Design a protein around this ligand. Structure first.
Ligand SMILES: Cc1cc2nc3c(=O)[nH]c(=O)nc-3n(C[C@H](O)[C@H](O)[C@H](O)COP(=O)(O)OP(=O)(O)OC[C@H]3O[C@@H](n4cnc5c(N)ncnc54)[C@H](O)[C@@H]3O)c2cc1C
Ligand SMILES: Cc1cc2nc3c(=O)[nH]c(=O)nc-3n(C[C@H](O)[C@H](O)[C@H](O)COP(=O)(O)OP(=O)(O)OC[C@H]3O[C@@H](n4cnc5c(N)ncnc54)[C@H](O)[C@@H]3O)c2cc1C
Ligand SMILES: Cc1cc2nc3c(=O)[nH]c(=O)nc-3n(C[C@H](O)[C@H](O)[C@H](O)COP(=O)(O)OP(=O)(O)OC[C@H]3O[C@@H](n4cnc5c(N)ncnc54)[C@H](O)[C@@H]3O)c2cc1C
Ligand SMILES: COc1nc(C)nc(NC(=O)NS(=O)(=O)c2ccccc2Cl)n1
Ligand SMILES: COc1nc(C)nc(NC(=O)NS(=O)(=O)c2ccccc2Cl)n1
Ligand SMILES: COc1nc(C)nc(NC(=O)NS(=O)(=O)c2ccccc2Cl)n1
Ligand SMILES: [Mg+2]
Ligand SMILES: [Mg+2]
Ligand SMILES: [Mg+2]
Lengths: 582, 582, 582
């Protein structure tokens, strides 16, 4: 079926083998920045006609783009970098991919094998450096292993709990001529035997049983449900259980639905956190009981039976000890429970209307809210407008901080892989590159990066990439001249004592600095600024209607605070629902 | 002597202790970017009146600035970052500092101790990640250890072979109140006992003896001589031995001197490499026999007695086996030999005029040269002009690649700590941030970053820093629209098959992209472009005369090649002296 | 309360501090073998009047003795060794203690700090070597830390899941004078916060509920119940659930009871494995679903709801995924469930008589059995006799192999800490030293080491220890001239092809070699041999009645096979119930 470009008996460079190894895996796009140790690989890349390379302007841009690509498509993201500085520049991306469980395969060039460990030119023990921040990594010591290792990397990166896998390739191996063997079996006996088996009906029926016995059930859905949109949907229309989502799970269940409790956690809706606080049955599907969501573990869902379904056994009982657990693919567990629910339907007569109403009153007394001051632009409103004008069908990537929380709170994601945000590591400068990857993976999609002025500038060099690759990336930059989230904490716990959180120029305290419009102009990207809430709709509409890349600099008053808010390690009774930096 | 800001019996936060620990070390400047895990530290920082913080726009900018500061002053560079993404963003800087032996102390915030290892919010096992890329690192587990650890870090970072040291500080320890003890003794028994003792007269006199017995001696000076400018100078006027320098040693011995052979190695002068190739006595002072300098080890200085003086025993005999060695401070060895040379002068009658002439004919037949095409600007010429107009008194930082080689070849550094360049790791995007650190460390100095368009854009966000900090940083950007060095290799070994080395926009192949002038404008930094060699002097002069920051975009034809060139792993007989991309 | 031997302000050697640190922990016995690096510690030991040292003849003897002491008392075992060879000789003991979760604190001397890493005299990176085979270890770098580290070691070794903890003490620190501070707080924030909290009533009642709903319940008790003898007993008299035990759990529930199913697993009774195979509710208390017990995981308790209570979260769901779990002290869970069971007793009306009878028929059709040939001594019978003559009140330690299985199968342990056997690592030569520790910990107890001729000889040198310490250790040596278990496997899966499993002398195939009686005589220990089953009772009785140490060499035909037997990775349907080496 696969048509190679070399005779089955014709020897070729290891670099060429590595590229074919990629084509055989179905790869079509890679984000690679050339360097001495990886030149051979780049040369091999130009010989490929099925793989396109998106040259970033910084290796970190490359990784984040790869993540964007992966997070928005469901396939693994591939980035390539040279040795030393090239390799060390991917570190944040790898750590990010590991914490958010994003399938990713990073390939780095290395100095020739014989020089490893000699402090050679541009040498870095990347395998050693990245062992704790990757799902697994390799150091290819023989051209003969390229096929097997590549197959294993993709397998490991995509199977079970997705994650990043790095493959270190010495330059001399890239040049070694050889005849590849694509029939070799992978050496993952331990991993294979550990792979969860399909869920047992005994376990699933016990769950359906717990549901019928509960009066206040609550679904706690996370990043693990990203591929169970339909299954989860059906499950909810068969149980009528309210759905609370984590930052990573947004979109698994349409935010625009009456059964939706929206996001829970530190900055979750009061009703979502309420539901969990008073639930008698917590269905944790594809979540990891993060401190951002739980606060004080002992107080989290303290009055209910916890059912936890996870593909990673290491997560079951890590922070919260479940009453019932299922180590497997939540998608399969849902399909299983759905059948049981469809059959034993009449005899179950599930009805949580009383609970739903208890929550709907909370949803009404404590809804998400924002204040409008004069003609100042409320960031929440801007995002709300983008939603309307894009009809909630846009792929949204973001930076980290307040704008990120608002992008999560005021945009209703219809489907998963529409929300691209760094949740676990929370790495700034992720938004723009991620958008780049998402755009390449979804050419006909509306891609909007809702960024912050601090996050946006970190990888601003990627604007060059966007132009040269002619990607229709839109940038909704919520400019508040500060490091928002840190500022909010200064206001709340440090008597508003500013400590290096102001990003503008003190010499001209009132001038917007820098001028993001000029960064755009430098890369030939049309841009505009908005300051009056009245001009907001037309401005956003323009951004959307203008073909190609576009940057809309939205000025916002910095004293805005993300609400509600439960201080770190706090309880639902510690939730803050009012106040700001004014 | 030291006046604290807290009563000797008044308990204060660990954060405040950490800051005082810094003041007690003489620190006046730190490059810190605030984050949740490091908020306490930033708050403590604002309470200090002796330490100023230069807020970068990217943690990598912070590290590189810290390196710049260190490399240009001789003191350790200090950078601070928050946990997770903050910490991972320093990795390239740390690796860079370790490979170039730059004294540096990096401090990172960590999640609260009890949460370590739980995949907490913004958590990264930084100590684990950085163990192989730092001279040493720590994880503070008790506020009581802050004083001792900080003292040890600075001691380790600055003593022996300088290098980076990272200190991980959990947030809960930053908040813990305690009464510091500054009298605690450091726990470095192994390290202390390993510290080299002053050189023995027996060893030194044997060397002076080898000198008198040699007819073709050659000094091979490196980064280890950065603090022996005077000693080395005197040594040369007492021996008349020609001096060859490494990329890291530039400036140790004035490049503008008849005894100077300039730089040796891959892109060294033909005469410097010649001298070493035919020397009978190689005096390797403060060097590490890097593959970039030696090429094929067996062929390197194959006909001579090698004397190697290094502060690191691990380096003596690592790649080249010496005939005579001295493990100690080259500065002391030089002072020692100088005395011997001054006394036994008359009885020594050292005269290598014949050797010097054999070399001076080579210096005349094979000098550094460049071609001028029409009115196109030769990068070599631009750097040559900057030298003249600054009278070689400027602190020069650079990026990596061809421009870097030219900045090394065509500027005559009078003193050490004037040349700030990433040699071992060769990290791109180092130039601008490094200049920032150098400027802060040397407020009244002329600081010029000779950058490349590829390297410059990677950390372009630091332009914001330069403006807001009102630093007189000048940027001599040699714009060739390509990744020069990789391009050169494509031309030489890949039939000029371009593979992602073009940085401009293919849609407008002839338009200069991006427009670096607009990046400058965005940060309110005056800029200008030059294309005609005729307008070069006036342009540079303007850059220099214009008060404050300035960016001069110098367009250069990309087909330029760095020469001479000895291919990797090659011999002096493999040196390439002609040709380019035309 | 504690009376030191030094003035509260009088400085003393670190060695003396370490010893007092031990006395303050309640230590009374340590097993230490002197060496250069630990001389100071031994000297300090002689100054103590509350701690006695039992000098072994081999450091391995020391560790195994320490394990014996711990396993038979419930307190931690303490062994001390010098640097290098001393330290490496404890390795098997540490690994053994970790796998069986035996509380143990090992202290080793180290070379002076400054010499660490220099390949010094008798130096070994023991901390590095033992990191993967100890619960935790330390390298003391300052005399000031001795108090804290010792406290932490004992705390870590005894709390949660007990295990070994090694403390490396450099010689120079042993000699350093200092004034100890016993008030210092331990630095175990992570560990402390991880310690399981008392079980919740919600979880416990769900379990009691599952019990009332089950028809075929089976208790699967392990080493975790060693301190819940009473609780478990009460639990069984309130539920009437049959009890199956692991090799490590023997004695938790009296083997001489109608509700007892005895041991399960590879060599478990047919009825115990049957019960588990057909159970609908498996109560796994204090077990780790070892491959020796489960065989093929998918087939293990495949038809039942698994409730797993473990003090180590890492164990819950490791090999078998539970339906219900409880991470906590099984002792507390039992006390909790017992109350619920006592109250809701009448309304529960628990009665599993039908199940018990289904099992009692199996217990009758497939009981433990052995064949008697002529006058040859059946090892099973010998152990059976020892049981009778000691009235099952003896502390039994063993070696590894067939004799071990028989000691487990044919002796009815009344209480826990009566069975001392290496289960996880299965280390030979454990029996004799372990008995030594058990005897010292229980001076008035009958201590019998049921050993094998292969296992017995490995640490035969400890016979010297037994004599000199005048310990009433009895040795019931089942001599079969072979490596029994390996031989059995040769017979079963290798066509009885002997491969180095014969321990006698081939020159005299029929002579018993060696003559264990003479090893005993060498250490002045009375001994005797038995060959005829008729003389067995009188012989054993003599061994028991003779005051002091005694060795009874019991000759047995080697063709005996342990039965029943389920081949590794097998199913209950693969159980072998007949055959031998004849
Ligand atoms: C400024 C900031 C503020 C934040 N505030 C909040 C907040 O208020 N609320 C909030 O929710 N988060 C918040 N976060 C995000 C937060 O840090 C965590 O990233 C997020 O809570 C993790 O959610 P998750 O566990 O659901 O998803 P993940 O972290 O993606 O974990 C998914 C889990 O699902 C399992 N799984 C994966 N695939 C499958 C499958 N096929 N079948 C079954 N199981 C599977 C995994 O192995 C894993 O255990 C914030 C982050 C930042 C940067
Ligand atoms: C594109 C590119 C091209 C390059 N081309 C060249 C080239 O052609 N020629 C070239 O020279 N380099 C070149 N390099 C730089 C090269 O990679 C190495 O960084 C450089 O050769 C190292 O020189 P060094 O050993 O002298 O200095 P360092 O790497 O700084 O090593 C100094 C040594 O001195 C010892 N020492 C330190 N302090 C003291 C003291 N007080 N007393 C005694 N000993 C001490 C150290 O411990 C160490 O062993 C290039 C780099 C790049 C990025
Ligand atoms: C030759 C040979 C043959 C063998 N044959 C068999 C056989 O046929 N059958 C068999 O059973 N074994 C057999 N074994 C022993 C076997 O290898 C394992 O050591 C044994 O099965 C382990 O049993 P366990 O899990 O119950 O106990 P352990 O290994 O001691 O594990 C106890 C578990 O309890 C938990 N726990 C500890 N303290 C507490 C507390 N206070 N509260 C709650 N939980 C706690 C632990 O953390 C752990 O997970 C054999 C060994 C050898 C050498
Ligand atoms: C300036 O040196 C340089 N520039 C490019 C673009 N490529 C390389 N390649 C190179 O040196 N390759 S090598 O494999 O012989 C090598 C030798 C030692 C350490 C690393 C590497 Cl990559 N060099
Ligand atoms: C959005 O969360 C956030 N933002 C800021 C600016 N600071 C913090 N700090 C925080 O959570 N501190 S904490 O020490 O309680 C902590 C708990 C768990 C993991 C990491 C950290 Cl720093 N949070
Ligand atoms: C034969 O050497 C010897 N014998 C005994 C009984 N004790 C010691 N002790 C010794 O050498 N102590 S030392 O602490 O100075 C030491 C130095 C280097 C390496 C290890 C040790 Cl223990 N020596
Ligand atoms: Mg902002
Ligand atoms: Mg360039
Ligand atoms: Mg035997």
């Amino acid at each position: 079926t696969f048509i190679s470009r070399f005779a089955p008996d014709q020897p070729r460079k290891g670099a060429d083998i590595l590229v074919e190894a990629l084509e055989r895996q179905g790869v079509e796009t890679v984000f690679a920045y050339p360097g001495g140790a990886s030149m051979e690989i780049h040369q091999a890349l130009t010989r490929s006609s099925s793989i396109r390379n998106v040259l970033p302007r910084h290796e970190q841009g490359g990784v984040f783009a790869a993540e964007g690509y992966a997070r928005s498509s469901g396939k693994p993201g591939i980035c390539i970098a040279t040795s030393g500085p090239g390799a060390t520049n991917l570190v944040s991306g790898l750590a990010d991919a590991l914490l958010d469980s994003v399938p990713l395969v990073a390939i780095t060039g290395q100095v020739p094998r014989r020089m490893i460990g000699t402090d050679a030119f541009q040498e870095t023990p990347i395998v050693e450096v990245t062992r704790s921040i990757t799902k697994h990594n390799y150091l290819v010591m023989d051209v003969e292993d390229i096929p097997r290792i590549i197959e294993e990397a993709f397998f490991l990166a995509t199977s079970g709990r997705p994650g990043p896998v790095l493959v270190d390739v010495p330059k001399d191996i890239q040049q070694q001529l050889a005849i590849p063997n694509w029939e070799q079996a992978m050496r993952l006996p331990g991993y294979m035997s550990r792979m969860p088996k399909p869920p047992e009906d005994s376990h699933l029926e016990q769950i359906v049983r717990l549901i019928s016995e509960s009066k206040k059930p609550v679904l706690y859905v996370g990043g693990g449900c990203l591929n169970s949109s339909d299954e989860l949907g059906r499950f909810v229309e068969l149980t009528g259980i309210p759905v609370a989502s984590t930052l990573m799970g947004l979109g698994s269940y349409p935010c625009d639905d009456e059964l939706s409790l929206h996001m829970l956690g530190m900055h979750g809706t009061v009703y979502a956190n309420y539901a969990v606080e008073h639930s008698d049955l917590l269905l944790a599907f594809g979540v990891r009981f993060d401190d951002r969501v739980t606060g004080k573990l002992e107080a989290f869902a303290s009055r209910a039976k916890i059912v936890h379904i996870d593909i990673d056994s290491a997560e079951i009982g890590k922070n919260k000890t479940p009453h019932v657990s299922v180590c497997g693919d939540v998608k399969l567990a849902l399909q299983g429970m759905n059948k049981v629910l469809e059959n034993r339907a009449e005899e179950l007569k599930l009805d949580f209307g009383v609970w739903r109403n208890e929550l709907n009153v909370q949803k009404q007394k404590f809804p998400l809210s924002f204040k409008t001051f004069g003609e100042a632009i409320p960031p929440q409103y801007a995002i709300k407008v983008l939603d309307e004008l894009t009809d909630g069908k846009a792929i949204i990537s973001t930076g980290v901080g307040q704008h990120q929380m608002w992008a999560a709170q005021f945009y209703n994601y219809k489907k998963p892989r529409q929300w691209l945000s760094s949740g676990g590591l929370g790495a700034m400068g992720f938004g723009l590159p991620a958008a780049i990857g998402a755009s390449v993976a979804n050419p006909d999609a509306i891609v909007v990066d809702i960024d912050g002025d601090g996050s946006f500038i970190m990888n601003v060099q990627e604007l060059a990439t966007i132009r040269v690759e002619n990607l229709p990336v839109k940038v909704l930059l919520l400019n508040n001249q500060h490091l928002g989230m840190v500022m909010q904490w200064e206001d709340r716990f440090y008597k508003a004592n500013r400590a290096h959180t102001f990003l503008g120029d003190p010499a001209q305290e009132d001038e917007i600095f820098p001028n993001m419009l000029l960064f755009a102009a430098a890369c030939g990207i049309p841009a505009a600024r908005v300051t009056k809430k009245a001009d907001l709709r037309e401005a956003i509409q323009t951004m959307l209607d203008t073909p190609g890349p576009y940057l809309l600099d939205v000025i916002c008053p910095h004293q805005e605070h993300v609400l509600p808010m439960i201080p770190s390690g706090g309880t639902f009774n510690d939730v803050i629902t009012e106040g700001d930096g004014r």
